[PDB]
Design a protein around this ligand. Structure first.
Ligand SMILES: CCCCC(=N)NCCC[C@H](N)C(=O)O
Length: 275
């Protein structure tokens, strides 16, 4: 049971209302809810059917157009689960079915209650040795402060995330000591700020497309290193970079439709490691 090892993943059906009410930073083209289902279906298929991860499929709630991006409502570290208080208000009630699910999974629950503390899981990078909470439009001091308190086993440092981005809008773990990072000067700056406050040097996998830096690494047994990345079709110059890693079983995964509403790969699931 090494870094990135999981046995379970929590997912949640996306509601029909996401099509027109899901919060979105940029005004893009219309969201084809149907394709989103297809994409989301395959996404869970990879985690469960293909990687054997026991998947818990929370039902969709129409009133919570963002219930599908479960990673923002909770952060699980080893055996302890931290239900967050989303940076967005209209997303606060997603905690209910999530605390419900983690409870059923016998995880130590620690709820973020503080009326002045916001934290979206998307702003949190668990390198497997420490945490990196992005302070953004969604996450503040108290957020990281409470999270740091919840995981006293690990060092927690905060890094400034500008605009409507989240820390993981440009990075994520692509493996042990491997931090996937975007080329943007803003991306590279955020990164540098990170390692300065660390004791160990992380190897970095730089990708031209900043959002492609968002991916999923997994240490699945009989497989080894697993990395679900954005497909060549969606980001060829970034996909070509992931292609050079021969020690990782590379599984392309499209997310264009949900990306229309700021939803990336990591966003769609919570990975628990129940041993
Ligand atoms: C890798 C994280 C990217 C940002 C993020 N939390 N994405 C998922 C949430 C999207 C949702 N529409 C929101 O406005 O919160």
């Amino acid at each position: 049971a090494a870094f990135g090892r999981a046995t379970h993943a929590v997912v949640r059906a996306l509601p029909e209302s996401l099509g027109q009410h899901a919060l979105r930073s940029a005004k893009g083209e219309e969201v084809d809810v149907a394709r989103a289902e297809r994409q989301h279906q395959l996404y869970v298929g990879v985690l469960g059917s293909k990687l054997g991860l026991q998947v818990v499929e929370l039902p969709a709630d129409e009133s919570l157009p963002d219930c599908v991006f479960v990673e923002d409502v909770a952060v699980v570290c080893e055996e302890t689960a931290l239900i967050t208080r989303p940076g967005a208000p209209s997303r606060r009630k997603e905690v209910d079915m999530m605390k419900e699910a983690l409870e059923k999974l016998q995880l130590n629950i620690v709820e973020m209650k503080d009326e002045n503390a916001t934290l979206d899981g998307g702003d949190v990078l668990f390198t497997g040795r420490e945490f990196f909470v992005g302070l953004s439009k969604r996450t503040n001091q108290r957020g990281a402060e409470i999270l740091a308190d919840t995981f006293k086993d690990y060092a927690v440092s905060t890094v400034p995330v500008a605009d409507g981005l989240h820390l993981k809008s440009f990075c994520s773990m692509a493996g042990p000591n491997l931090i996937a990072i975007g080329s943007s000067e803003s991306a590279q700056k955020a990164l540098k700020i990170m390692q300065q406050m660390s004791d160990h040097r992380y190897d970095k996998l730089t990708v031209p497309d900043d959002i492609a830096a968002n991916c999923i690494y997994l240490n699945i047994p009989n497989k080894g290193h697993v990395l679900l990345h954005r497909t060549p079709e969606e980001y060829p110059e970034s996909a070509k970079v992931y292609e050079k890693l021969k020690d990782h079983m590379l599984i392309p995964v499209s997310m264009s439709e949900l990306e229309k509403v700021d939803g990336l790969l990591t966003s769609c699931s919570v990975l628990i490691n129940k041993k």
